[model samples]
Target: VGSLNCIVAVSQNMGIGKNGDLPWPPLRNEFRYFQRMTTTSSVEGKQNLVIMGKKTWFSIPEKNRPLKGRINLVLSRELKEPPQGAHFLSRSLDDALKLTEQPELANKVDMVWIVGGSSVYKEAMNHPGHLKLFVTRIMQDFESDTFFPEIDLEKYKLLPEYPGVLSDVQEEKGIKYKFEVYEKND
Candidate 1:
């Protein structure tokens, strides 16, 4: 019965996708950072749940739409049918939290990751609670239409960082990257 806290994200505007395997516009480096961070904790059949906005859920490629093993939670303005793999649905962050608190959900999964598009992160980040964030920086600049919200550095502390060499993302030519992690100070 080890239930980790809720709130984790893989996509961010300022970061890129893994080593340099560019997902889209962002750098390819973040791809490694986020992927590893998101998947690292769920060993030994530990239940992991991800609460995301509708747009974020849709952003997942068709092949990977329903992330395997992890519980899927979709938050949208209008109620809609859960995607093929979603375990739960909610209209807002609060609702999502409430659902996680339920005995059925809580018994299975303790950690509720809040992966998102821009809005979802903004809402959970600003909430009055603690969150640990994993971030990465890449060498390439991307043409992005989205961005992660500006977090108050004062609220978080630079706990530790893993300096990584830039891995070339063949799809995007030559781009490098690094990984960083932060935790709530207060």
Candidate 2:
């Protein structure tokens, strides 16, 4: 079975959002990395789960409603149903987890990637299974109102190098950042 994963770009202070959006300047290569990790599946004929929360779903521009190449699953209790282009909608993280394991979708998914706002990160952290985090650490700080949840080092370990991920620092538009992989210690 593929592992459950979460991906995010955080600032030096562990900030991820500001006023309903990302706090740092957009990095093309970083998002390319995001797309690469989520879209490329090792399992033939199966797509990875692009699971996210309400505001995170709306955070994308209209033209890119359903991110291409991956199965989009947004968790939202208030969203009546799947948004225009999303594939599925569930009431909570537990609900979505069950859906993936159901007969209808059990064999169609590869890895589970939680792309999110703050709450979704908090929820997914409590999930059972192999949880890998794909985090882009922006070396600088920015004004941010929203923040990623406090991580317990005792539960997760920072991996030095991971397959298909660069370990060196990356600079874009003078903003420096680096990729990190953390395996939830079992």
Candidate 3:
């Protein structure tokens, strides 16, 4: 129903997860940045949508979800119902997109934030629409079993920076990183 964007943290080697969780320790301001990006809406009464796979859904801490302020959509065909605290359950990324466009939600949903696992990221990336990536480039390498997907620079161009997105490299807990935005060309 709106622009679809994927937000993720990647290490120097593009590692995103390990043992079904983030490879690194908690980052205070980085987490805050994510919160600000997803929670705020330009229009009154409109809530942004956060769509993620079942793995990524469970990846978030119990108390921190339904991610507080965004409409959470967990994509899983196996789930008989929406997971506890989740507002809705979707069968696939395409299905979730369609769900947002329904009359009841079309006006109320401001943006689509694809917080992912491997498959969904690729699905959203290859999707035709105003898709973007809000990636936190972690400057150091970390152990990870799951990796972020390959990004085709030809299709998406990395913008100079984001509005109030901490353009400069930030250091916390001794790890340096920065926020970047990659928008589709067409």
Candidate 4:
């Protein structure tokens, strides 16, 4: 298997939305789903590191500044060192991938993930290699301007889906969503 995993909020436009909310239904649930599935728990001795864009990093609420457990990789056109518990990579995605394979991290569980911030996901998904997606499809139309990108659906095979209902407060959004796990088709 390749040393990295690319996971992101699927969207064509590079914005989370004007008010900083995820563009679809069950926002918090979507993020939590990403966290639960991408982390080391399911991968055995392997660790799953998440790489996100500068904007995405800043988007984390001040109270939640440093994401716990998971490795935070910040990708930006600018940024010298990662804040406290994070890793920093400038410009090219190549550098980002290098962070995952470099000697210091080589012995680690071999799962690298490209997390979020629209353009970041777009670039990672389009990168020249196999990519796995954990897609969560929302069942309703949202009031936001941002959206997930058109996935190359044919390039991946849906492996499994765990369907569920939305939170009570979120039910008004007229959306229900389920987790869809996908792996690249060789």
Q: What residue pairs clash in candidate 3, if any at all?
A: none
Which parts of model 3 have CA positions greater than 4 angstroms off? Answer: none
Model 2 per-residue lDDT tens digits across residues 39-110: 989778798888999889988878877999888998998988788999999999999988988987788988
> What is candidate 4's lDDT per residue for 1-186, written digit by digit as tens?
234455555423323443665665446666676666566545555566678787677766767656666666788887766665565555767777766567755556457777676677777777776677765555545455644566676776776543332323332245555556667634
Pick the winner on TM-score between candidates 2 and 3.
Answer: 2
Stretches of model 4 off by over 4 angstroms after superposition: 1-3, 9-16, 24-29, 42-46, 160-174
Please give the CA lDDT of all the candidate structures: 0.60, 0.87, 0.86, 0.61
TM-score of 4: 0.74
* Per-residue lDDT over 150-185 for candidate 1, one digit per residue giving the tens place of the 0 to 100 score: 657877776554334233333333544444556673
Q: For each predicted model, how many residue pairs clash, with residues at least 3 apart or on different chains?
A: 9, 0, 0, 8
Worst 10 residues of 3 by lDDT: 160-169
Clashing pairs in 1: 16-27, 17-28, 17-30, 17-31, 18-28, 18-31, 18-32, 20-169, 166-177
Looking at candidate 4, the ten consecutive residues that score lowest on lDDT are 163-172
Model 1 stretches astray by more than 4 angstroms: 1-33, 42-45, 161-173
Each prediction's RMSD over C-alphas, in Å, is 5.2, 1.2, 1.3, 4.3
| lDDT over C-alpha atoms for residue 63 of model 1 | 81
The lDDT, on a scale of 0 to 1, for candidate 1 is: 0.60
